[PDB]
Symmetry: D2
Subunit: 479 residues, 4 copies
């Protein structure tokens, strides 16, 4: 193989630079050096604003059951249908150099390359989240990140925000339970979290929840181990995933959904669209749909993992968004941030390209335009020259909403009920004790006035929750 410059010019020697004499200065004509150096100098792009640390693999999605009565989406079109998928696992707060085995939620994004375009299901390992209004997401994330002056993690920031926004109770509980630190990516479940809308061939709609359970089973790391691992192998999650697939132990998840008719959405105790709530299985049981199988490792991490981009707004006919405020905000945020992190034409990047689909429209140009830019095809719509036409079949399902167009406060929607049921029913005493210790061990670094409001909140879920945490805190502050 002949070593070349970016323009393909053979290189004579790329181990020594051109100089005027053996001990003289460097010359501009040594374009070989500059060409390489200039590229080295531009190797980095900005990391994801959140979920920066990640692992990636590829595979397919396979339909196992008929749910066409609910969704007309081609990805579900017929039993046994296989569609290629791209998956990206990740943590949340930490940046590119951080450890994988730390307490944090886990991203679990799945990209389906369907013939009706790509369908990005950007979920995580928890069915719920910390807040229910997108406008608090930047603040939340800031509080989870580094102090603006010291650039250090700040318990005060974390808990002042959480104590002031108690709706964070439900997810804060899930996050500090054993599931706060899964043993790798293959031993956790995935959830779309938000409520989405399914539409069938008949134009009738229903609301759903997406779920994909680990076929390898749930397995978590104790805090002792997680800590040891955060230092022995910060990239433990990446290694584990890549070695499994590499050795043929292809991990898979069983994909189900929960269905809620519009009526049920009403009789539902709470706001069905509040991200801090779940749909109790007992009441809305899981419906089998298919499998997700990861059977291929990336070849080039930067090209296939760092540059991949998932947009919740990527939804094909049969799948639509619900009124969930959080999701509504995510419809804008992802493409927006992608045009920034990656570039105006990031969808032309191989992994983000909707290759099983025929992309035709009236969009043109932009930096780094790679394709033919759709040749000389007429660029305005409508036109009398046979350019791409719109197709009615893919029209969105319309609903009539009532009320004024204003800001409705949801800070006071139920913040503790489901949290109680999870604390006293779902968990057992061990889990319950640990839950308290993990919270206590982290909250203890916060200022006391913050510690106090935090505990009041936990007390509202259950006096035992708060009081036991308060006990450990006392122990901690005793020192």
């Amino acid at each position: 193989d002949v070593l070349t410059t970016g323009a393909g010019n053979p290189v004579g020697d790329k181990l020594n630079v051109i100089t005027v004499g053996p001990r003289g200065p460097l010359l501009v004509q040594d374009v070989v050096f500059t060409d390489e150096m200039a590229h080295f100098d531009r190797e980095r792009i900005p990391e994801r604003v959140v979920h920066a640390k990640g692992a990636g693999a590829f595979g397919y999605f396979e339909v196992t059951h008929d749910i066409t009565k609910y969704s007309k989406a081609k990805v579900f079109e017929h039993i046994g249908k296989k569609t290629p998928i791209a998956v990206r696992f990740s943590t949340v707060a930490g940046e590119s150099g951080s450890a994988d085995t730390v307490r944090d939620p886990r991203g679990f994004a799945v990209k389906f390359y369907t013939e009706d375009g790509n369908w990005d299901l950007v979920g995580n390992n928890t069915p719920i989240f910390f807040i229910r209004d997108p406008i608090l997401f930047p603040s939340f994330i800031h509080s989870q990140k580094r102090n603006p002056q010291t650039h250090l993690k700040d318990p005060d920031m974390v808990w002042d925000f959480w104590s002031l926004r108690p709706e964070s109770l439900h997810q804060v509980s899930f996050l500090f339970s054993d599931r706060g630190i899964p043993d790798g990516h293959r031993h956790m479940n995935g959830y779309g979290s938000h409520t989405f809308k399914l539409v069938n061939a008949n134009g009738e709609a229903v609301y759903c929840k997406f779920h994909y359970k680990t076929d390898q089973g749930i397995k978590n790391l104790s805090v002792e181990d997680a800590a040891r691992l955060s230092q022995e192998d910060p990239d433990y999650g990446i290694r584990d995933l890549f070695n499994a697939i590499a050795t043929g132990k292809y991990p898979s998840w069983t994909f189900y959904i929960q269905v809620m008719t519009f009526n049920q959405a009403e009789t539902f105790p709470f706001n069905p669209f509040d991200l801090t709530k779940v749909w109790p299985h007992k009441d809305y049981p899981l419906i089998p749909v298919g499998k997700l199988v990861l059977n291929r490792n990336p070849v080039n991490y930067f090209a296939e993992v760092e540059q991949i981009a998932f947009d919740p707004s990527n939804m094909p006919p049969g799948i639509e968004a619900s009124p969930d405020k959080m999701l509504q905000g995510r419809l804008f945020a992802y493409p927006d941030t992608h045009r920034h992190r990656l570039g105006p034409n990031y969808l032309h990047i191989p992994v983000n390209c909707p290759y099983r689909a025929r992309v035709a429209n009236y969009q043109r140009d932009g930096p780094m335009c790679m394709q033919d830019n759709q040749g000389g095809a007429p660029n305005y719509y409508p036109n009398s020259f046979g350019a791409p036409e719109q197709q009615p079949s893919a029209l969105e399902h319309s609903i009539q909403y009532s009320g004024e167009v204003r800001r409705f406060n949801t800070a006071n929607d139920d913040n503790v009920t489901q949290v109680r049921a999870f604390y006293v029913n779902v968990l057992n005493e061990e889990q319950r004790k640990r839950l308290c210790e993990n919270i206590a061990g982290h909250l203890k670094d916060a200022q006391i006035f913050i510690q106090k409001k935090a505990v009041k909140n936990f007390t509202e879920v259950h006096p035992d929750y708060g009081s036991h945490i308060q006990a450990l805190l006392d122990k901690y502050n005793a020192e």
Copy 2:
């Protein structure tokens, strides 16, 4: 007719109406179709070329007709009858993207050769010489030619102040204001590499050279009157003329020659052989026919194949190297540098720029908008024991020893008039000399009178009649 889609390939039910709440209500964020299309339109523009922004493009090939292997081992020259695909871009200089084509200004005539040894870019224009002989005055030169930093208007004071303060411009200024100043479209003008380059053959022997490609359609210019009229009637006269031609099968071509000056002759040349304000008289350095340039294919999409194309003088395949000309030396850096800005870090992946006849292989990786496999998992460090791309000793550059110390050498002492008088008195006949003086006076008349004097003194240093006739004309205007 194709099915209309979003960038992610999702079918669009209706792209003529936006989603609102009620027929006369606000716009919805979930109308992802609108945002997708709008966010792209919003990013359709990249920055124009800092200079030579207005252009035209066409494609074809270069075919070798004569054997010059004795001078250069470049593959593009390898054997007679050999065709090498080429991309060309014609352009003006000062004007920006919407300026008129038929105006006095030099003309860019850039040629890209997709050779097996990588791309070879010959970035030249319709003149053998330039206005200055040191790269460091180029930005100031261009500034003086563009708009006033405040009024944002053309400034004759900036134009002639700089020229009169830099008398080395006499030669090019004289060519610029001659009939050749406004070629009748790109098909009727010549092309030159202007700079002296270095050719190396298979024995390691080298000579200096000049590249010329004479228009096989013949020299044909526009009267200033016509030029003015077309600038109003058809600002893109050049683009249209080039395009109709090729589209109607009247493929324009140029005969490619080279002038050779041995290293010994380089010493005995009257002037500095590397001074860009000088030419190599044919009378002493005959044109040697080499091949032909033929443009037979119009671009399919202008943005993709013309606006985005990038030519780098540093792109020279084994056999062709740079000379110590200061100007060329400076351009060795400017182009890829500005290209990494205008197009992006990975601009060489954009199709028209990709060296597709070559086999690129190196240790460069990542960068924004990485398009290929990013060289997969191949070892990314050199040297290495895992058999990656090797450097080949054949392509090693020509070696030479130089006299003197490393520091800035004043070149304002170089002749500024000798060849100019030659051009004024011999090369041009009465008619022309007159239109020449008239063309200059019509532009210099607008400059402050003290500048007019500094300039006349220069035209006088060439020939007394040259300066005085201009002053005669100026006196009229100044009244």
Copy 3:
């Protein structure tokens, strides 16, 4: 004089000769002075605006002359005699950065009011109406107005195939091809907010409005002949005229008025009061005097104060809000979006864009080129228990409840002729009608006949004489 430095503040000894190895040797990399200046010159360009690229800017102030506090609580109108600094930019539409000013096209008349309640951006133009009334058609309309994607030439088929398939364009097209189509410079044209907006008073009561700013210098237009001559003679006519006036003290001004329409009146309105293709008859909704716009200072550096300026329709202070106009609605997103692309994430830090008479404070941080103290160490999350900025309830937005389903509502078939027939028959006299048909036909004749047919079909719909006369003229052209 001042010592010449590199950008880093290092003194330059000689910036007229580059460092080379000997008088006739190659260029050195340690000539950082050269690289530094060249690297910057290489990045002077940024993308020009996607539309309204060719512009002229100035500065001045707004002064309240009358009292409208009963309609709006906005501080800028707070009390008679109150003055607010303004920034303004006039412009054409389709032409790119180097096009001619004196050509047929609408004219942007953007006004930035630097108020204590933050910047208020009134982005309007010389017409009260527009060609389309749904933002999703904009990119196509603009495309059809610019160059052919392949030949890169102005294309009459694209212009008329679009306008003929979308007759809602009739009104603004009749206005554009009338005398008002080519105002004699920026100072002799009116300014309009075009869109219907909403005003809110201190009591929470709201009304709809139209913004108007009539030229005190009187309406003056250029004949097509003059326009042509000038596009040739002086492509930057509009720039020079504005600049010279202010330079000599002939400060241009505009009387600012508003038309008011109560919500009751909004219901009874014959058309859709938020339809961008329609006006509110002065007879039924008279102009109410408000203040004065005065431009008394030219820019000192064009690139910094004009090219880099950015107006966002979504920049509206309390007392001023958006109406449901689909067009306005989309613009709320498009500008800050395109601005983050053309200028960058922190384009609001650029001096001309900074709301300097306001006290910006929030939880936003970082981003490319953060130019301030980035709000120091203040709490970067909301809410917080550390006295960081708090939302003030009085700035809440006005609440309305709309009726109907959330879906795309076709408006292509709204009224496209009535108000046009009024303008053609009532407003214009015969000299004007003649000239209008001549101007239209003169451009419509370059279009293919089927395109011509459909066009004349719509004009005939407005009035049999309008359509028939054009046809007549066309017949001569096709002959």
Copy 4:
């Protein structure tokens, strides 16, 4: 409490709830308060430095304590007692933005002196030498120190394949694996310009030199164990230490020296004086005291003052110039180039990069995010008959003449063991050598065996004991598995 606003300064009524059509309806585009804040959130990340990504910043001053004017006319040295404000950024090399501070790896030690003659950046590390001596191998070396291009995991075969095929590295490698590989915080390590620079006096006379700033807080390193326990307990240890130190009055300081080698001495140095893998023995070239560096102020906002800070070795004011050191010659280009990418064309306008103690005037204009007045209406072309800024001849660079032709001269074979043997036997005590061999074996034992052979091969060239002690260890390891 100030009023909360959008980026355009418009007051925000409610920034805790978004606008929807009804309490259970979709989100509206007209809620621009939301979009304005969300849009910015979506952009707060810029590219991290390609190397030395993880860092810590602080500010203070440089004070002249001795007179070295006979060597340099640089104003920063102008006279005894003269103080010049400075900015410093410490860092590691390989790890990216979230990596741990306490890990074996060199440490960046950048100093920006805002002088009257412009800024002077002395971008050095905590070592006098480096792994390679030709800039064309730097990208390769860096790639080998980072993640596998496919697995994205650290890769020992990559690390050692490079170091074994490029033995010139032996010197700095022997240092990187010594106790000084993991300093205890940034306050207990030395600072070196490393490269050989050139000093010029008011007479035009020039000399070559080495800059050194010794830690007044004294040398101090972390044991491998603490370094690891720490990489887990506090991955930001270095930042916290430096910050608290300064916040509690423990302002850290360094003493600034220089070594001078005349041109005559230079032609007789047993090695290439401009070889980044060599040092000038203090015995033959005594350290000359010059001044002092003091860090007494912490940043107010890290992003603005630290992540956005940019140092360019090419930023040198009159009196200070570069030497023909191949490595340094390369960096003269890399930094401004990379900065244009990382920060932006006008990255010099960012406050901490601005040469605020100097008076910037030239013919450069425009570019994205032009923050200043863009030098108003001043004439933008040079020369001009309108007064605009002028070159001052006194600032002209020092000129030398070199012998030889213009080409690539291999240096892969210059001395690779001599100076290293000195360090191994003379400099280090028995204790140290053992720890050295151990820290090497512990990391190299993961590399393939053929890579191991070649690596040991070279260590042997430095000293039979060196190589055998490592091999001895490699065997036990390779056996254990």
